[PDB]
Amino acid sequence: KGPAVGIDLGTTYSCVGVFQHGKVEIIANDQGNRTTPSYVAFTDTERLIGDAAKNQVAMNPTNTVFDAKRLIGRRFDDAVVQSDMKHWPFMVVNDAGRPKVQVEYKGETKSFYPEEVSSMVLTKMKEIAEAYLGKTVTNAVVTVPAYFNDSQRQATKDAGTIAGLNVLCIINEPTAAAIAYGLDKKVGAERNVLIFDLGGGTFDVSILTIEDGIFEVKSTAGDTHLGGEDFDNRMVNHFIAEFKRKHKKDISENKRAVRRLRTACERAKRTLSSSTQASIEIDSLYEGIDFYTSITRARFEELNADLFRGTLDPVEKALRDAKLDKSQIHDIVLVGGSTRIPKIQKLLQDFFNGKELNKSINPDEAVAYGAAVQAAILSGDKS
Amino acid sequence: MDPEKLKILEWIEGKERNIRALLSTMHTVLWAGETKWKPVGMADLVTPEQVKKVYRKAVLVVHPCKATGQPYEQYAKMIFMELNDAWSEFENQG
Ligand SMILES: Nc1ncnc2c1ncn2[C@@H]1O[C@H](COP(=O)(O)OP(=O)(O)O)[C@@H](O)[C@H]1O
Numbered sequence: 001k002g003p004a005v006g007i008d009l010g011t012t013y014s015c016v017g018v019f020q021h022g023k024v025e026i027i028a029n030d031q032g033n034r035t036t037p038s039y040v041a042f043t044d045t046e047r048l049i050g051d052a053a054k055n056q057v058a059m060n061p062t063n064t065v066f067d068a069k070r071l072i073g074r075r076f077d078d079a080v081v082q083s084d085m086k087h088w089p090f091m092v093v094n095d096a097g098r099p100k101v102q103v104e105y106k107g108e109t110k111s112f113y114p115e116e117v118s119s120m121v122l123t124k125m126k127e128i129a130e131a132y133l134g135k136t137v138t139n140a141v142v143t144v145p146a147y148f149n150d151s152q153r154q155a156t157k158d159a160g161t162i163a164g165l166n167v168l169c170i171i172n173e174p175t176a177a178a179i180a181y182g183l184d185k186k187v188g189a190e191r192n193v194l195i196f197d198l199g200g201g202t203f204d205v206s207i208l209t210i211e212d213g214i215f216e217v218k219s220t221a222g223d224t225h226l227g228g229e230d231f232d233n234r235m236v237n238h239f240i241a242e243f244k245r246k247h248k249k250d251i252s253e254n255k256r257a258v259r260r261l262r263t264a265c266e267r268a269k270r271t272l273s274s275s276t277q278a279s280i281e282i283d284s285l286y287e288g289i290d291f292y293t294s295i296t297r298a299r300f301e302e303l304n305a306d307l308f309r310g311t312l313d314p315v316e317k318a319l320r321d322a323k324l325d326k327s328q329i330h331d332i333v334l335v336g337g338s339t340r341i342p343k344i345q346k347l348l349q350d351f352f353n354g355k356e357l358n359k360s361i362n363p364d365e366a367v368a369y370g371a372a373v374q375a376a377i378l379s380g381d382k383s
Numbered sequence: 384m385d386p387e388k389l390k391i392l393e394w395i396e397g398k399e400r401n402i403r404a405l406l407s408t409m410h411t412v413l414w415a416g417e418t419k420w421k422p423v424g425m426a427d428l429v430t431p432e433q434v435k436k437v438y439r440k441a442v443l444v445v446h447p448c449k450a451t452g453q454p455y456e457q458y459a460k461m462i463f464m465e466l467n468d469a470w471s472e473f474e475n476q477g
């Protein structure tokens with residue numbers, strides 16, 4: 001029967017892969033993207049998911065939902081939930097001790113549990129793999145951060161069940177990445193692996209010891225509120241001042257213009273990973289005024305200097321909690337979309353004294369890649 | 384040398400991918416501590432329906448997901464793997 005998939009169900013973007021014909025395919029959505037925003041837009045007519053959801057956020061901020069992974073498996077009165085709520089433009093309420101996302105859908109107020117919201121994203125990733133395979137998808141492996149507990153794991157599984165999936169296993173994101181590189185298929189003495197995962201909202205360092213295919217999380221570190229979104233924000237403020245200088249207008253107070261600027265900054269940011277400058281081009285940004293401008297890689301790097309270099313403290317921290325020296329880790333693996341930033345890679349590599357990084361698998365894809373490998377073995381479709 | 388591994392290695396090769404032979408003797412290679420698996424006799428392994436029924440049961444016991452972080456993790460996967468290949472070979476028959 002039909003193959004099983006791997007789904008990286010991510011805080012900011014999700015990704016799906018299938019292991020078929022001896023190879024893993026990370027599957028593009030219908031807009032051409034190999035990853036998909038973990039975004040759910042509610043409107044008067046439709047429910048939108050992914051690229052279509054994220055693109056209308058500027059117009060529809062209060063009914064566009066993201067960061068559900070931050071609510072999943074948590075109680076309303078969890079200190080993390082209470083602080084996170086400040087950032088979000090959508091509403092969060094208490095149903096009997098459980099967090100609910102409250103939105104306006106089809107001119108009626110509806111509320112959804114975190115695992116329900118994540119089910120919708122999982123559903124979309126399910127559809128992405130079904131469009132590609134030309135057949136229905138049921139079995140999945142889904143990934144979860146190493147530091148997730150049993151409540152968050154169970155709730156992630158339940159989001160699978162709500163999506164129509166039979167979740168074969170819930171596995172750790174760092175572990176899946178190591179599997180993506182086939183590090184668990186090495187023999188001999190125990191190897192130490194370091195996972196450097198910098199995504200859109202979270203930064204994770206994990207150290208694993210692998211021996212005879214068996215993983216052990218030795219230590220974890222990072223910052224659950226540090227990712228690409230923050231580098232975006234540095235550029236956003238950079239240009240808010242620039243628009244104020246050129247035009248004597250301040251856009252800080254206009255939700256729509258600020259978001260529209262973030263979207264251009266994020267696109268610009270990706271360009272800077274492969275090129276040394278990027279142009280920004282927004283029609284009628286504010287009160288009729290076209291914004292056109294340029295930004296160098298150097299300028300991007302220095303706008304983010306502190307955030308980039310502080311990325312190494314969690315490395316050192318995980319390294320001591322693991323009771324290992326820099327020289328003692330055998331594999332470094334780059335995970336997360338923000339690790340495509342050249343200055344982050346030099347920064348990490350120079351910390352390890354020039355040692356080569358595992359980066360050939362697209363970092364924002366390495367998790368789903370490993371989950372797909374695992375789904376296959378779990379189904380008897382690999383070796 | 385790993386004695387619990389050596390016993391599974393020996394079980395695997397002695398039964399020659401006979402799904403029924405493996406299923407009917409799996410209790411002699413499960414880790415000490417395993418409590419769910421009641422031994423099957425050939426008598427409940429005659430029809431393909433029976434063999435299907437029992438293999439799904441065996442696969443649940445030794446499944447690699449449940450066995451993660453367990454002292455018998457490696458052996459569960461050794462068994463699961465051989466079960467899957469025995470079953471695929473059982474299904475090729477015909
Ligand atoms: N080429 C690139 N250069 C810089 N940042 C990138 C690039 N590609 C993706 N990103 C960023 O990576 C983040 C998403 O990372 P990803 O690992 O896909 O998601 P998640 O954090 O949800 O796991 C976003 O901030 C995105 O802007």
Ligand SMILES: [Mg+2]
Pocket residue numbers: 010173197199336367
């Ligand atoms: Mg990630």
Ligand code: NA
Pocket residue numbers: 008009010011012013014015199364
């Ligand atoms: Na992701």
Ligand code: NA
Pocket residue numbers: 197198199200202203204336
């Ligand atoms: Na991350």
